[PDB]
Design a protein around this ligand. Structure first.
Ligand code: ADP
Ligand code: ADP
Ligand code: MG
Ligand code: MG
Lengths: 49, 532, 54, 526
């Protein structure tokens, strides 16, 4: 769980909701995409490869 | 060359200093606006703690040195006195008006033109509010009062508790309703006695169908419950009779001393017997009662309460139909008491509230009164509940007196800003700029509301302005005037549909007071501070 | 025996039922009808704590 | 030239720092008394500023003796005082619960969740907590003395008086039962006024008992008066039995030889008349809240009457309740109904080196005194505090006859019920709801920590047990640190106490979560 502090900090500094970003990241990585992370070029919580 | 013993500030320096003071006062309370606002906890440097959200309380508790800031503090106090709600909004609006007016002045616009533009903008904003942004409460009913109370109690410690507190406040206000001459229904708030006591949760707050006294019986021998009460209200102490300054007792025949001393108390004994001979059961007095008359009342099996507050006694007498008697003297020169002076109530009980006892006068006849017992977790929460309840009662009184309400959530501010920006182009050349800046300054309320919710203030206010511009331009889409701010989700929402209402008098009085405060501060271009 | 202050014990047991410029300014203002008992002390020297608690 | 907006001494703090500081202060206040909960708690010595020593484990007393500067700590102290005043038990529990809820709230506040959402979730959780507590309650037959004694014992197993459990339970039950009163259709208990606790250092604790009457530290005014009366008729008074000045200025002017002697003789005659009026009722004991003159003492002894003077008003009211008398201020208005018949014995005996007055054989007395004998003053003070807790619990049970399982069983049951209910929320506020639900586990966790067993394994086992169907009464044994059933161990507590604790803790968390700005140092401006 301590690894969640990195995407959470990135989302907080970017200005979005960290919980939504983390939930989306878990969903995508459960789907099987290991190269998906936070997209800071968006006004809403979003992820991209 | 002046040789004045003091300091002098002139020009842009003093104007900037005044604007700084006003902005600082605004920033003190700007974080406690709207439902997403949060309270402040003040310490009185002696250990006293005050947790509150009310702007007037915060500004009164603080000690302020700059006089331009004292102007805003007393402006908030005036808004609290004359309306009871919108105390932070008026301060914020006045500070924003002063800031934008100072910007205009620094742009070499003469202050007289700015003041004239502000006056014109305030007049036209009031006219537009009265003519376009009012909803009659006749076609809404009790739901309008409930929604107004809920909106008032948002941003307060009784927010989610609103579903219950709104019903309690509405019932309390409707209980004390009376009509004066000209058939005008006047609702006399501050007649609802608010009693606080820590203990059970807020859900356990009780609304008394009668009156509640913060006092107990004077003697433990008296009964603590009387069913068919006959209240006798008195305004004189029941003690041993003592002669006044102009009367002096001098004894030359020693045989009269015993008679004198006996009569000294027999006078009061006869008065008590005369009072009790009419069937009185509850005796309330503003003065004190000594042990002798307490024993008299004990033997008769009747209530007797001393040191009752004058306002409480007046309310009890008015509700129960009793008459205050400062003395026992008819127009025949005698000393008599008749049953026509007795008030009646369906029950009088000394109840226990968290290890302490208070007297409940239940179901007074010939008039209905009300009182509220607030139960909390500690003293501070009870005080904050009392303040919020007073705000809600004032809001309900305003709504019931004047039957016009306005949409909440900054809808009125956005509509006014759009209308005034459109309107400024039809008046003058520099008062045009003043009216435009007035319109821009009116946008501070929705901006603060959005900021306090950690929402995108710029986008939300832009969408609100677009909705109101479409409403004002298109005459077939006038239903968008009610679109306000839904801070729970950060989206525009029809607040009239959502039930977010405020009295129109709140907006009107806040605008007028803020305009006068800004004009008063803006007239200063020089300050002389004499050394004490 | 009045010299022993028989009421001293009852008064004690009911007492526990709890239920530079400043020196000038706090006395220059406020009502003259109330009694102010100023206390003078210095840390370290014994005897101040007892009367402070009193 | 110090031009300023606010005063020089005004200090303002706002933001995340204020919330963190408030939550940390509440946590540390909880940590102060965390170890004083459960049957295996430890004593704490408090050095009173006035030189006294307070040795106790009651949460309210320990928190009251502590002076703090942080306003959140003051709020927590006020919370403890409110809990003590409302129900008389659960102060440590409510403090610990408030601290735990504020901790789990800080956890969310570190993220980007607004405090209003947390407060709304807390209020919904509190409503569900109340519902579940009312659901899992059981009724009690108050007429069963054994059940009441067991309830009081379960209340006092965590105090120093637990060594003498049956004696303390019987004392508390008898005091509460005999102080019960009903007049004019109004029912009352009034532990505060009547049921006085009188402590006399010395002797042994097993000698403590509740008397069928009152007992005061008073002696006869004159030694010739009887110190032992079989069936006294007691008369109570407030007015002095001595010649006092009138209310008005009443200067005399003596110009004859015999006026001075006549005035003194009439003083004596007035005293004689008052004494004759008192004697006309033929009483045996006269009690006055004010002084009795020596001539009055002589005139009363002439009629074989014992007189006691300078009695406190509360003591006189207690005597009136105990012996069925009515306090009278004017002897000339003394009625037969005012004479107190019902006291079965009045006796003045010396305990140690001080005379005490006993009225201790009243039939059907509505007031009583609890005579405590102990090792010293501090031990007797702690015993009195424990007896107050027991009497408050007994009164709560009598007024509200529902019971709730103890030993943390109720906490775990309510936590499991709220956790199960939270599964259907499907919202953003479900997380604070579940967090504040699970925060109730701090009570069994604290019980296990104080007992000394392994916290994690025991909590896991208790949660697994509570996931079953009929396991709401399964809690933690406070002595052996094992999972037992409170329908077997017998630890049950009033529903009112648990309800008050839960409500107060949740509302304290709500109140402290609302603050985000602090300004201090300003003048009182009274
Ligand atoms: N439920 C709500 N939704 C949106 N806005 C609201 C709601 N309730 C109140 N408001 C707005 O929040 C603003 C702040 O009001 P408040 O600060 O509580 O009054 P005061 O200024 O007297 O303290 C008001 O102007 C009102 O329009
Ligand atoms: N015999 C026992 N076994 C296990 N737990 C007990 C026992 N007796 C009491 N408890 C628990 O101890 C708690 C009471 O602690 P206590 O010291 O009374 O705190 P407070 O004074 O705040 O009520 C209750 O929650 C109860 O569940
Ligand atoms: Mg308001
Ligand atoms: Mg306890």
């Amino acid at each position: 769980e301590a690894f969640e502090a990195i995407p959470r900090a990135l989302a907080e500094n970017s200005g979005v909701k960290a919980n939504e970003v983390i939930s989306k990241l878990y969903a995508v990585h459960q789907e099987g995409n290991k190269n998906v992370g936070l997209d800071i070029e968006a006004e809403v919580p979003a992820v991209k490869d | 060359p002046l040789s004045v013993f003091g300091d002098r500030s002139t020009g842009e320096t003093i104007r900037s200093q005044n604007v700084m003071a006003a902005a600082s006062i605004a920033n003190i309370v700007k974080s406690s606006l709207g439902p997403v606002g949060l309270d402040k906890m003040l310490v009185d440097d002696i250990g006293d703690v005050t947790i509150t959200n009310d702007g007037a309380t915060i500004l009164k508790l603080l000690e302020v040195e700059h006089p331009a800031a004292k102007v805003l503090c007393e402006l908030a106090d005036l808004q609290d006195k004359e309306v009871g709600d919108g105390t932070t909004s008026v301060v914020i609006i006045a500070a924003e008006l002063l800031k934008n007016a100072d910007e205009l002045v620094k742009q070499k616009i003469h202050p007289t033109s700015v003041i004239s533009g502000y006056r014109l903008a305030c007049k036209e904003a009031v006219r537009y509010i009265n003519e376009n942004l009012i909803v009659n409460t006749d076609e809404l009913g009790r739901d309008c009062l409930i929604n107004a109370a809920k909106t008032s109690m948002s941003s307060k410690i009784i927010g989610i508790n609103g579903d219950f507190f709104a019903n309690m406040v509405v019932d309390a206000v409707l209980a004390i309703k009376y009509t004066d001459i000209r058939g005008q229904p006047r609702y006399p708030v501050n007649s609802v006695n608010i009693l606080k006591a820590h203990g059970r949760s807020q859900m356990e707050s009780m609304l008394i169908s009668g009156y509640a006294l913060n006092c107990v019986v004077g003697s433990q021998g008296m009964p603590k419950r009387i069913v068919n009460a006959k209240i006798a209200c008195l305004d004189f102490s029941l003690q041993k009779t003592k002669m006044k300054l102009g009367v002096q007792v001098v004894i030359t025949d020693p045989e009269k001393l015993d008679q004198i001393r006996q009569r000294e108390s027999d006078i009061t004994k006869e008065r008590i017997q005369k009072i009790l001979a009419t069937g009185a059961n509850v005796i309330l007095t503003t003065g004190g009662i000594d042990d002798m008359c307490l024993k008299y009342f004990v033997e008769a099996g009747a209530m007797a309460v001393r040191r009752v507050l004058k306002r409480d006694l007046k309310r009890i007498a008015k509700a129960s139909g009793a008459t205050i008697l400062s003395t026992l003297a008819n127009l025949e020169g005698e000393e008599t008491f008749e049953a026509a002076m007795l008030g009646q109530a369906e029950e009088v009980v000394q109840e226990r509230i968290c290890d302490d006892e208070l007297i409940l006068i239940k179901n007074t006849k010939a008039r209905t009164s009300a009182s509220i017992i607030l139960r909390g977790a500690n003293d501070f929460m009870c005080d904050e509940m009392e303040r919020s309840l007073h705000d809600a009662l004032c809001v309900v009184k305003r709504v019931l007196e004047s039957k016009s309400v306005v949409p909440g959530g900054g809808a009125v501010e956005a509509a006014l800003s759009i209308y005034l920006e459109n309107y400024a182009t039809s008046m003058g050349s520099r008062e045009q700029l003043a009216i435009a800046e007035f319109a821009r300054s009116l946008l501070v309320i929705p901006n603060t509301l959005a900021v306090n919710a950690a929402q995108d203030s710029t986008d939300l206010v832009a969408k609100l302005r677009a909705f109101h511009n479409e409403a004002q331009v298109n005459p077939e889409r006038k239903n968008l005037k009610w679109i306000g701010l839904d801070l729970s989700n950060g989206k525009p929402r029809d607040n009239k549909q959502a039930g977010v209402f405020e009295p129109t008098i709140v907006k009107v009085k806040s605008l007028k007071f803020a305009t006068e405060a800004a004009i008063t501060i803006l007239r200063i271009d020089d300050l002389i501070k004499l050394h004490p | 025996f009045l010299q022993q202050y028989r009421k001293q014990r009852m008064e004690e047991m009911r007492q526990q039922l709890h239920k530079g410029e400043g020196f000038l300014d706090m006395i220059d203002k406020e009502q003259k009808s109330i009694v102010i008992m100023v206390h003078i002390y210095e840390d370290g020297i014994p005897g101040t704590e007892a009367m402070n608690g009193c | 030239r110090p031009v300023l907006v606010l005063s020089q001494n005004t200090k303002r703090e706002s933001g995340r720092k204020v919330q963190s500081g408030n939550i940390n202060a509440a946590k540390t206040i909880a940590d102060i008394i965390r170890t004083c909960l459960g049957p295996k708690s430890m004593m704490k010595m408090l050095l009173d500023p006035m030189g006294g020593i307070v040795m106790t484990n009651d949460g309210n007393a320990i928190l009251r003796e502590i002076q703090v500067q942080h306003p959140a700590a003051k709020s927590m102290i006020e919370i403890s005082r409110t809990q003590d005043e409302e129900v008389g038990d659960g102060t440590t529990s409510v403090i610990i619960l408030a601290g735990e809820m504020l901790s789990v709230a800080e956890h969310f506040l570190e993220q980007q969740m607004h405090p209003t959402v947390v407060i709304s979730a807390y209020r919904k959780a509190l409503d569900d907590m109340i519902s579940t507590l009312k659901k899992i309650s059981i009724p009690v037959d108050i007429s069963d003395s054994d059940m009441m004694l067991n309830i009081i014992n379960s209340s006092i197993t965590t105090k120093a008086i637990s060594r003498w459990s049956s004696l303390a339970c019987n004392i508390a039950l008898d005091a509460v039962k005999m102080v019960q009163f009903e007049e004019n259709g109004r029912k009352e208990i009034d532990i505060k006024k009547y049921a006085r606790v009188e402590k006399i250092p010395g002797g042994i604790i097993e000698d403590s008992c509740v008397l069928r009457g009152v007992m005061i530290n008073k002696d006869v005014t004159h030694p010739r008066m009887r110190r032992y009366i079989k069936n006294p008729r007691i008369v109570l008074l407030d007015s002095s039995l001595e010649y006092k000045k009138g209310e008005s200025q009443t200067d005399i002017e003596i110009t004859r030889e015999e006026d001075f002697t006549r005035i003194l003789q009439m003083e004596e005659e007035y005293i004689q008349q008052l004494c004759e009026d008192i004697i006309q009722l033929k009483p045996d004991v006269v009690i006055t809240e004010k002084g009795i003159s020596d001539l009055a003492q002589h005139y009363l002894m002439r009629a074989n009457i014992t007189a006691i003077r300078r009695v406190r008003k509360t003591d006189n009211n207690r005597i009136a309740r105990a012996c069925g008398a009515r306090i009278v201020s004017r002897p000339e208005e003394l009625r037969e109904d005012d004479v107190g018949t019902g006291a079965g014995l009045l006796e003045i005996k010396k305990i140690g080196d001080e005379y005490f007055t006993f009225i201790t054989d009243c039939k059907d007395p509505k007031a009583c005194t609890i005579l405590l004998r102990g090792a010293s003053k501090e031990i007797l003070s702690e015993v009195e505090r424990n007896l107050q807790d027991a009497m408050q619990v007994c009164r709560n049970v009598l007024l509200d006859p529902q019971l709730v399982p103890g030993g943390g069983a109720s906490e775990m049951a309510v936590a499991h019920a709220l956790t199960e209910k939270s599964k259907a929320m499907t919202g953003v506020e479900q997380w604070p709801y579940r967090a504040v639900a699970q925060a109730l586990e701090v009570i069994p966790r604290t019980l296990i920590q104080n007992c000394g067993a392994s916290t994690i394994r025991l909590l896991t086992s208790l949660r697994a047990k509570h996931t079953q169907e009929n396991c709401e009464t399964w809690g933690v044994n406070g002595e052996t640190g094992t999972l037992v059933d409170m329908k077997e161990l017998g630890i049950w507590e009033p529903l009112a106490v648990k309800l008050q604790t839960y409500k107060t803790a949740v509302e304290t968390a709500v109140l402290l979560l609302r603050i985000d700005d602090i300004v201090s140092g300003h003048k009182k401006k009274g």
